[PDB]
Design a binder for this molecule. Structure first.
Ligand SMILES: CC(=O)CC(=O)SCCNC(=O)CCNC(=O)[C@H](O)C(C)(C)COP(=O)(O)OP(=O)(O)OC[C@H]1O[C@@H](n2cnc3c(N)ncnc32)[C@@H](O)[C@@H]1OP(=O)(O)O
Ligand SMILES: CC(=O)CC(=O)SCCNC(=O)CCNC(=O)[C@H](O)C(C)(C)COP(=O)(O)OP(=O)(O)OC[C@H]1O[C@@H](n2cnc3c(N)ncnc32)[C@@H](O)[C@@H]1OP(=O)(O)O
Lengths: 387, 387
């Protein structure tokens, strides 16, 4: 088997309170907390871009041996800082991975970390001693006072894909569905997505149902065959609308289990917000750490990207996987953040658009142990390495 | 076996004469004709964007059956029109390929068409009835009077990867080499590449040597094993400088053959200019079509992207490949263009930058048999389809 061997995330060290953002925006707090299903929104300091967050997610799981064995670094992003130079190259450099490796970005809105991991697995079929690093890294920034704003977030997920993986085998059953639609897109020149709010909800649910139905059909499986489903999470309620749309005809045991998995799966996302390519895979971590699935059980995964493309595949838990997740570490990482007011979040938002550094506001002296964007000079990003 | 089953390229219907550009820039024509090695530069009308060019390279080579069999559509480009929505979705739609297909872009300067086809190969290992469509599509635009100007070009190359390929079997010997360098890049916000002209000649050549050296070591091979070599062509001279840096330690015979190969390999490129992701594969078409390689012989391929990643793999010519190329159509395509003056080319240049339509300047009436960009409305690009 080949699958997810190691996996970790990172989010920036600040968040804003969703109840507070709501007061600021003239809406009932419960519209965000219950209606949208989000409790705290990640806030980007200028000193984290996609590369640092990316390196940060990666640095704890890659050992000196991985550096030697990794044959591709693949970055999944719709928040690119270059039109030509792949983020994969800088991250590859920051992590000191061996030179004989393909580095590149993949792009298809929030979908791309899926083709990255699936194709890492196909890559490794005939290269058994090698490994692949796939990083999802993104900043969902819709604009201040926008329709999208409540669902904003930022972070990254790192997966090391390998033979005989310690966490999840990726099964050979992925099926993909593409349908050209204008739910969401960001033409060059645009800081913020164009978004058709209602259409995107429809597009998502259609994409899921087309993918699921076809998957069920090719594999002869049904919902009863899954311990849990895991969904791309633009906001926790979205995955729920989509699940409820296909589970009406499942029996009661299956509904109780899949609904409940779902709750476990969106536990982290609630405190972070949408992270585009990483959202699914963040929800995967949340699931694995908050639920107690047994080795041998099967997870159904739904990956969506605006525009649109969706995919459903399954993955099977490996024995002892619990030993390869860091629940306490991911809880420390969310709890240890610092709340900022709505005014402070807005300052941050405006600084981030223009990349206006301020070492005192980003409080960079705190970041001695992480990678961070320290400066731009002659149009080249400079990074601080972990001390 | 798995490799390139079908391949075709498209360039826009206008070129400018390189001797005439030289006079407008006040250098001796021969600095472009021999020094850089380029004779005609492609001129992009507004009506030809990366999606229409892409669809044009592909439309002549996919049958109704292909449409049912294609399981992924991958676009390699550093000239993307959207930060989120992949051009692959748009092309998938124009060409009416069946909906159960992964569509996504890959990005790494001029390199991305290589990982696109190599991962398509790996994708197909266990899927004997599927095909993959890979489209390289780019506009190399450095700016009026920039150092890069003479090496501008625009086009696309399209490749159907499949089992039992008609043309080339892709070997199991690729090795890539990543080195983080600032030779060429384009931060978001820049319409033109930031380039360090001299560094990039060095980084190119260094990348080729590293990759070539590692390949030889791993595969126990030398240049004498190769019927011909084929390189990423940013200008015909660059590939000749990279080649000459490694064949000095080779018997007169390997030297004569490889240098001659090179020359067939760059015939077409001479009349188009740089096409980033498509340059190596354009050059591949020109080699298969101008030279008389025998079934069974072996081509050694070098692929390069700024920033930088490079790669060396091999490919073997299939019995009957000649019955599967379109030499006359490709000669026709090049010969059927209309020369524009330098003023005209500059007008086309500024029009492209701003996407200013003009049906008469682009002579769209002429384009009844091809895809072209007819309009942008509510931020959505509209396409004319082949009548
Ligand atoms: C970007 C992507 O990643 C794209 C995708 O995945 S596609 C699917 C996801 N779409 C997106 O995230 C696109 C961007 N998002 C948006 O446009 C918006 O932020 C949004 C559509 C998610 C929110 O829209 P909105 O107009 O602020 O809220 P609205 O759609 O009115 O409803 C939100 C919820 O509030 C709830 N409700 C309203 N007031 C409430 C209150 N006071 N208490 C409790 N619930 C309340 C519900 O009415 C509603 O949920 P239901 O569907 O269960 O009725
Ligand atoms: C974008 C990418 O795809 C990046 C890469 O692949 S790395 C590959 C190279 N980089 C690029 O293609 C992009 C950048 N392009 C450029 O910077 C430039 O257009 C360029 C470096 C190609 C040429 O710039 P330039 O100032 O015209 O360079 P220049 O010094 O004139 O070199 C051109 C040649 O003119 C020749 N020479 C000068 N006058 C001549 C004349 N009258 N007759 C014949 N030869 C002449 C040669 O001297 C010189 O090359 P040699 O090394 O063969 O002598």
């Amino acid at each position: 088997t080949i699958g997810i061997d190691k996996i970790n995330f990172y989010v920036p060290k600040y968040y804003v309170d969703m109840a507070k953002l709501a007061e600021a925006r003239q809406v009932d707090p419960n519209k965000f907390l219950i209606g949208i299903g989000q409790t705290e929104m990640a806030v980007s300091p200028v000193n984290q871009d996609i590369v640092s967050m990316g390196a940060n997610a990666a640095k704890d799981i890659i050992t000196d041996e991985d550096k030697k064995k990794i044959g591709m670094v693949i970055v999944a992003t719709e928040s690119a800082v270059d039109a030509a130079k792949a983020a994969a190259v800088q991250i590859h450099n920051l992590l000191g991975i061996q030179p004989f490796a393909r580095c590149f970005e993949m792009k298809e809105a929030c979908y791309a970390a899926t083709p990255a991991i699936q194709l890492a697995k196909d890559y490794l079929a005939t290269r058994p001693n090698e490994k692949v690093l796939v990083i999802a890294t993104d900043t969902a920034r819709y604009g201040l006072n926008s329709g999208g704003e409540p669902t904003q977030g930022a972070g990254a997920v790192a997966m090391v894909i390998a033979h005989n993986p310690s966490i999840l085998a990726l099964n050979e059953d992925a099926v993909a569905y593409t349908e050209d639609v204008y739910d969401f897109w960001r033409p060059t020149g645009h800081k913020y997505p164009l978004v058709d709010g209602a259409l995107s909800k429809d597009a998502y649910i259609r994409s899921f149902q087309q993918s699921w139905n076809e998957y069920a059909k090719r594999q002869g499986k049904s919902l009863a065959d899954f311990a849990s489903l895991c969904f791309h999470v633009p906001f926790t309620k979205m995955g729920k609308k989509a699940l409820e749309s296909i589970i009406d005809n499942a029996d009661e045991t299956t509904q109780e289990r899949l609904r409940s998995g779902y709750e476990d799966a969106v536990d982290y996302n609630r405190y972070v917000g949408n992270i585009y390519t990483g959202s699914l895979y963040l929800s995967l971590i949340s699931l694995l750490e908050n639920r107690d699935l047994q080795a041998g059980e099967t997870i159904g995964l739904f990956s969506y990207g605006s525009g649109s493309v969706v995919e459903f595949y399954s993955a099977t838990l490996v024995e002892g996987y619990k030993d390869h997740l860091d629940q306490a570490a991911h809880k420390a990482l969310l709890n240890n953040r610092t709340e900022v007011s709505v005014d402070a979040y807005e300052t941050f938002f405006k600084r981030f658009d223009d990349v206006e550094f301020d070492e005192e506001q980003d409080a960079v002296h705190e970041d001695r142990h992480i990678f961070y964007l320290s400066n731009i000079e002659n149009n080249v990003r400079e990074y601080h390495r972990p001390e």
